[PDB]
Structure 1
Amino acid sequence: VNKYTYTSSKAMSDISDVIGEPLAAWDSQVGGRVFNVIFDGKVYTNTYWVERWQVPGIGSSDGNPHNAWKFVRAATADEINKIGNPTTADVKPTENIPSPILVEDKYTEETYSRPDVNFKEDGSQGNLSYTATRVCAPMYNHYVGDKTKPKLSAYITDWCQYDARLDGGGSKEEERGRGFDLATLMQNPATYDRLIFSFLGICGDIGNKSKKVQEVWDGWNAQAPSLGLPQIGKGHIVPLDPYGDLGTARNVGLPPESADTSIESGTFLPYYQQNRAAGLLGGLRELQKKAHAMGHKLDLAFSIGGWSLSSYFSALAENPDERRVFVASVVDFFVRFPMFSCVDIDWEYPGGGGDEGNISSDKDGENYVLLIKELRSALDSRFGYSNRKEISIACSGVKAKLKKSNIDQLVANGLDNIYLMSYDFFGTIWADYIGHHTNLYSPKDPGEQELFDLSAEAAIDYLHNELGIPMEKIHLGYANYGRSAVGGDLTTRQYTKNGPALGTMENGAPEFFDIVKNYMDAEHSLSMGKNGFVLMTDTNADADFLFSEAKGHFISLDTPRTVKQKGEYAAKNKLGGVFSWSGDQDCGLLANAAREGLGYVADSNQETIDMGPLYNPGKEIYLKSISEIKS
């Protein structure tokens, strides 16, 4: 564990029981040692870790993100003379850089140079960047066992796979794609307690991508007779791309040995098992092996359904036997990959919502409850209690449709956990006004917090108070991308609708790591807006954001400080658990901060990198709520 010492002295005659400490002016104090520094004639002790932006002045009953930088005013004028009393200051980014942060990518520079991309730091010549995640550094400190705190998790997805810039590419967005090697986390495993691969699917799904469903169903049905195995209809679960999952070596922390990447949908099927599992999923299995080599086993998991593949949920509803066959395929998958700690479902619309392709009825929620109970039953019928699985679903926070979800009966039917989608509240391309797509906290004037100012706390209170559900059964997290909006006016939150907005790959969805590259910095031990792009924070909702005047472009985003705020709240609550959505694109600094928000403590005096200076607030402002502005 980390350890630190200090000392104090007195005359041989005088022994204070208290830690005597040199009386001095405040100036950029930091750390754990006692400080009684003086400022504005007052005398101030931060009885908590000290940070170079923390200020005792405001600190009199403030000065740390949680409590009073307490004070006395014992100092006399001649003390205020022998020590030149401070009365104001401003911490600056230091001149040096205590730690490297990232490395350039040849191909990303080439990308910017591409005559279609034409990307520029200001985005003037190019609104998108398609920046390779390879730019990133490992960036993970190390931490104590800290067993009591709620579990930590992260989401993971297939977009880890490819960027043909590694192969030259140069003509199309995926040639300018994204991806990273899990070797990263392998370097220091146990970075999380649980993981969730992206929602996969089933035969018969309805959405745009369904040609993939067709192809794989074909491959399966072709293989099945040759394997001497029964054919499958709709509702059977799909692996989507076994070639990615297993027919891989790059980005999956494993030598190219045995990577028969040639194998695919028409041929993988024998390999569709953990023992045989090459590529990504296998790599995960070995990662867990390493993890256990340490101890503290990860809950390896995934789910199915989700934003873009939910379409068949209604269709499968009220087809009980097909639903049975589907969950049969579920448990079969468990048998094929008993490695998994559990897996879950990503139904998203008891009442219709999201993409319209998710056809839906009213009864959907009820039927969903029913089938859910039936699933639970099937699982229990399958599993041995010594190895039991316990299921979770997310929730959308749609104040009404969440009610329509009948969480009460789901709990009564052994659905153990809930993960609140805490992000993208700001449907920036269509939303009426700019807002924080992920605000936990209620801004002032809750009069309009119905399709806006969607403080997750409101739903939280619904479940806790208005539904009695223990926090244990509910989980929350954060995502590693902000929103970006054209022409926004900070006073009115009005903004240029439809106008194309910043993303490396996804317009309107600025990507955290590349934001670290382009717009924000910390190399000088601080939270540092850079390249002329405004660093900013709102007092109304504890909101945090970024701006650029030349295109009135705004970005709402979580931050180290803001996810810290989040984790601290969740921790003070003792929520069921903490996680991060879209974990695929943070260096890990936000994870270190998340540990901090969890109160999860580091285990050594050494660091991968610092984190304290990342919690200075941005340019302070008060932003009126939508209701306040309209009123």
Structure 2
Amino acid sequence: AAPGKPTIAWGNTKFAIVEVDQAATAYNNLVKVKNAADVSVSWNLWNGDTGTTAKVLLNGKEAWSGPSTGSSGTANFKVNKGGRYQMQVALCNADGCTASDATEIVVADTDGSHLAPLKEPLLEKNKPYKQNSGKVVGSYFVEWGVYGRNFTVDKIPAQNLTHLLYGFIPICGGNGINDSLKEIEGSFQALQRSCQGREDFKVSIHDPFAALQKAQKGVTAWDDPYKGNFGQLMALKQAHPDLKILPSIGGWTLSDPFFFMGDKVKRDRFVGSVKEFLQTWKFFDGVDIAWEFPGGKGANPNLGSPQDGETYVLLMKELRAMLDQLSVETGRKYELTSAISAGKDKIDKVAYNVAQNSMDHIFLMSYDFYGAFDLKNLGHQTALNAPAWKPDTAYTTVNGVNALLAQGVKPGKIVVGTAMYGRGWTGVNGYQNNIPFTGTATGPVKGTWENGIVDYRQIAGQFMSGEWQYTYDATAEAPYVFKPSTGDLITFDDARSVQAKGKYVLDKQLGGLFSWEIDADNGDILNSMNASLGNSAGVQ
């Protein structure tokens, strides 16, 4: 007679291809990429002949087999593809095979193949759009936004984007390499702990707790291997297979290492570490380089060189070559992007007409034109055009596009920036003809999180009532609110100025729109980005 029917032993059923060490703070120790997950199953036979061969099946297919030598057994074997499997133990002899009931086992991998799709409802004022214009609609999500700002990946309005960028992935290095981080309390020290035992100029994760271990919706169980932002982004990729999720390296405080990459020893180590990072974290679809800025004038006053332009072009070419090789290894398309200054003084330190051949998209940071960093020379921080009172204004969106076009950059590469925050001043005074921007200020406006900066959500919620004046400058294409009694002045984007940027993109055949930063919108800005580029209301 055939063997008795085995009972699968109670035991762990959750396994991982990329293992996470739950008591490690250094990135070298935190993650271990294997070629396959080690899986184990045990069984008991409560009734009958134990058979002569025992097998473990996954969806009917043998993953292990061995002699059946008593009433209990254990099998250890490797599984090299992520997902959920129906696992059975079968005992066989010459008269037949008798299979257990199925038990599901979960084999985790960093493409999110083990996770349910994170498909959450739109919140606040977000309305559903189809991505059918063919234009970029992008936004940055910040790693540290999950604490005070309480803005997690399940709150992103992800159906209304083509591109979701993750700010920011740091480059390892201590004194003289990341000195700009020492302005943020505990930040420099945090990176040195993550990078312990790791070479400088390799990428790492700045806050491993936020990125991988904080409990979040959909990834709360203790033995879910990937939690935090990266676990939720994997499940978001399962819900939105065509969303491009790009890691962004750099930003204001993590850009110092790029200024050493004229040494090709360092540049090659960096590029190899990006390759390894994308092999490790398979939910990401390329890399965004946010080097602020070639030539200097970023956070560190002691960096910047005439060599930086050449280094930027080399870096992009070598990044592209690495991503092209990864792309043919995997069958996937990988993207290379960069966030760049929109000021013409910074643009013309780089030959973007050459670098564009390596790049899918240029994110033109057409914002921060003005703000509480200068208390004397006030203006619209993100306007399309100059205002009527100063038609020679240098920093406008159109001037940054035109600088790129004059180099020979193709228009379709250029993605225009929108701000989901305002900048502003207090104590504005000495202005003519009721235009507050012709005066000077005494300090920054009171910000939501930091001095001088206000989330758009708070502008709309608090500063469009009471004593606040609202004006839409139709020459500049820019809104501003002004409180005359204290001289508080805030310059920002709204649905109408975004609509003007979107029409301008369509008119000039540019590549689309992107925004900083997704947590600060209430929905009005991203709704207008989508509508103004011609995306149809609704869902697919």
TM-score normalised by structure 1 residue count: 0.61
The residue correspondences of 1:76-225 to structure 2 (distance < 5 A) are 137-146=123-132, 148-162=133-147, 177-185=148-156, 189-204=158-173, 205-209=177-181, 212=187, 215-218=190-193, 221=196
- Higher relative CO (Cα under 8 Å, sequence separation at least 6) belongs to 1
Distance (Å, rounded) in 1 between the aligned partners of 2:302 and 2:384: 28
Are 1:398 and 2:343 counterparts? yes
Distance (Å, rounded) in 1 between the aligned partners of 2:194 and 2:250: 21
Q: Secondary structure at the match of 1:246?
A: helix
For residues 357 and 540 of structure 1, do their structure 2 counterparts lie closer, same or farther at Cα, with a shift above 3 Å needed? same
Q: Secondary structure at the match of 1:344?
A: strand
For residues 219 and 178 of structure 1, do their structure 2 counterparts lie closer, same or farther at Cα, with a shift above 3 Å needed? closer
Letter aligned with residue 192 of structure 1: L
Residue from 352, 357, 360 that aligns with 1:407: 352
Distance (Å, rounded) in 2 between the aligned partners of 1:215 and 1:532: 43
Q: Is the 8 A contact 1:351 1:362 kept in 2?
A: yes
Please list every run of 5 or more consecutive structure 1 residues that lacks an aligned counterpart in the other structure.
1-135, 163-176, 222-230, 261-275, 521-529, 605-631
Residue from 274, 286, 304 that aligns with 1:342: 286
Please list every run of 5 or more consecutive structure 2 residues that lacks an aligned counterpart in the other structure.
1-121
Offset from partner CA, 1:107-151 (integer Å, 9 cap, x none) = xxxxxxxxxxxxxxxxxxxxxxxxxxxxx95322223452x4312
> What corresponds to 1:590 in structure 2?
525
Are 1:244 and 2:210 counterparts? yes
The residue correspondences of 1:453-468 to structure 2 (distance < 5 A) are 454-464=395-405, 466-468=406-408
Offset from partner CA, 1:595-623 (integer Å, 9 cap, x none) = 1111212138xxxxxxxxxxxxxxxxxxx
> What corresponds to 1:283 in structure 2?
232
Q: Secondary structure at the match of 1:554?
A: strand
Distance (Å, rounded) in 2 between the aligned partners of 1:349 and 1:555: 26
Distance (Å, rounded) in 1 between the aligned partners of 2:470 and 2:507: 28
For residues 538 and 189 of structure 1, do their structure 2 counterparts lie closer, same or farther at Cα, with a shift above 3 Å needed? closer
> What corresponds to 2:458 in structure 1?
514
> What corresponds to 2:315 in structure 1?
371
Q: How many corresponding residue pairs?
A: 407
Letter aligned with residue 258 of structure 1: W
Distance apart, 1:346 and its partner CA: 0.9
Residue from 411, 427, 440 that aligns with 1:471: 411
Q: Secondary structure at the match of 2:451?
A: coil
Distance (Å, rounded) in 2 between the aligned partners of 1:379 and 1:534: 50
Letter aligned with residue 145 of structure 2: C
For residues 383 and 543 of structure 1, do their structure 2 counterparts lie closer, same or farther at Cα, with a shift above 3 Å needed? closer
For residues 548 and 218 of structure 1, do their structure 2 counterparts lie closer, same or farther at Cα, with a shift above 3 Å needed? closer
Offset from partner CA, 1:69-100 (integer Å, 9 cap, x none) = xxxxxxxxxxxxxxxxxxxxxxxxxxxxxxxx
Distance (Å, rounded) in 2 between the aligned partners of 1:420 and 1:209: 24
Q: Is the 8 A contact 2:180 2:256 kept in 1?
A: no
Q: Secondary structure at the match of 1:321?
A: helix
Q: Is the 8 A contact 1:432 1:494 kept in 2?
A: no
Q: Is the 8 A contact 1:142 1:602 kept in 2?
A: yes
Q: Secondary structure at the match of 1:155?
A: strand
> What corresponds to 2:446 in structure 1?
502
RMSD over aligned CA atoms reads 2.4
Offset from partner CA, 1:415-447 (integer Å, 9 cap, x none) = 232111011100333253221011112334876
Distance (Å, rounded) in 2 between the aligned partners of 1:178 and 1:304: 22
Q: Secondary structure at the match of 1:202?
A: coil
For residues 283 and 430 of structure 1, do their structure 2 counterparts lie closer, same or farther at Cα, with a shift above 3 Å needed? same
Distance (Å, rounded) in 2 between the aligned partners of 1:434 and 1:219: 40
Distance (Å, rounded) in 2 between the aligned partners of 1:436 and 1:152: 23
- Identical-pair percentage: 31
Distance apart, 1:357 and its partner CA: 4.4
Distance (Å, rounded) in 2 between the aligned partners of 1:259 and 1:444: 61
TM-score normalised by structure 2 residue count: 0.70
> What corresponds to 1:380 in structure 2?
324
> What corresponds to 1:600 in structure 2?
535
Q: Is the 8 A contact 1:534 1:547 kept in 2?
A: yes
Are 1:579 and 2:499 counterparts? no
Letter aligned with residue 478 of structure 1: T
> What corresponds to 2:374 in structure 1?
430
Distance (Å, rounded) in 2 between the aligned partners of 1:281 and 1:329: 18
Distance apart, 1:220 and its partner CA: 5.1
> What corresponds to 2:421 in structure 1?
481
Are 1:566 and 2:497 counterparts? no
Letter aligned with residue 409 of structure 1: V
For residues 444 and 257 of structure 1, do their structure 2 counterparts lie closer, same or farther at Cα, with a shift above 3 Å needed? same
Distance (Å, rounded) in 2 between the aligned partners of 1:144 and 1:212: 39
Distance (Å, rounded) in 1 between the aligned partners of 2:283 and 2:302: 32
Distance (Å, rounded) in 1 between the aligned partners of 2:191 and 2:484: 49
> What corresponds to 2:113 in structure 1?
none
